[PDB]
Amino acid sequence: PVYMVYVSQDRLTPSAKHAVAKAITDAHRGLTGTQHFLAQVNFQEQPAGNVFLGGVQQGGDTIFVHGLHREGRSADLKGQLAQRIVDDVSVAAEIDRKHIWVYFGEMPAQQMVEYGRF
Amino acid sequence: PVYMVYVSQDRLTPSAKHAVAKAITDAHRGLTGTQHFLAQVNFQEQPAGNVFLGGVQQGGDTIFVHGLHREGRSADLKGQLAQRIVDDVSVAAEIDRKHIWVYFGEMPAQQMVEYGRF
């Protein structure tokens, strides 16, 4: 899978980025059984002030995780995975989980290429 | 919902970013009935020259809005919402709406976490 993680510049130090990537990657392996190296976490940083909630400009605390997954998992499993990402990123980023948004999009495996192969 | 708004650096001043966020957020509330604070607008800025149309490098005017929505709305309603975003962002960004692209992706509610809850 690919987890696009949208954060404000300077909110996550390199150590914190590694910790957040580990939290997400461990949650995905542990709950779905997929191998480690298949989980990409891709941080997309923007300057603070680019996030609006209800039209109101925010500081730099929002973390939006957009997970791009293969179709075929149960709703219960996807909910457990989203909840684990919230809990574990809250620990890893030392952040109130009110700041964490997680959306999963799914795709047929036949239109997903990882490491240059299907 | 989350609206990822892809723009070129310097095309939108902070005032214009606030106006565009307000246009999108107001359109989403008004047409779907969802509450204000649930609408995130997340601006993703890149240097001018990173956008190609038909292989041709563009200036800094393209605005691509990628809305990430819960499934369950009618095609007519989604079309009205997309059209309103085009019209209202055209006003808010003082931009020819030939420059505005809007795509909506949808997801089951059970795999969407906002503010740390489902």
Added chain:
Amino acid sequence: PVYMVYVSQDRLTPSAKHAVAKAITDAHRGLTGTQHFLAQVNFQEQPAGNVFLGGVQQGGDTIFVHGLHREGRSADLKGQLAQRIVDDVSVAAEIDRKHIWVYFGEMPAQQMVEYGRF
């Protein structure tokens, strides 16, 4: 369609960005029959060190192509298109295709606006 291309800053020169955009755009026209000017390629650059694979921080070689398409094409056609993007971006970016990931998401045409029209 819109192809969001996630790369590390400095991996692609402007010439290489043009070559990669041409590879993707030509593959989409040639295989699907859509017109040239309808294909947007939008490069999203981030500093090297923002990509993790299996929790391990990478250099600047990963290229993730997220294609946003209209629904309605066959699985075989989508697979041929993904494979062509891998091959042709490998040539255009002078890069081992082990570094190239390609995911396609699809949407009803009625919720896709390009150039300010449906």
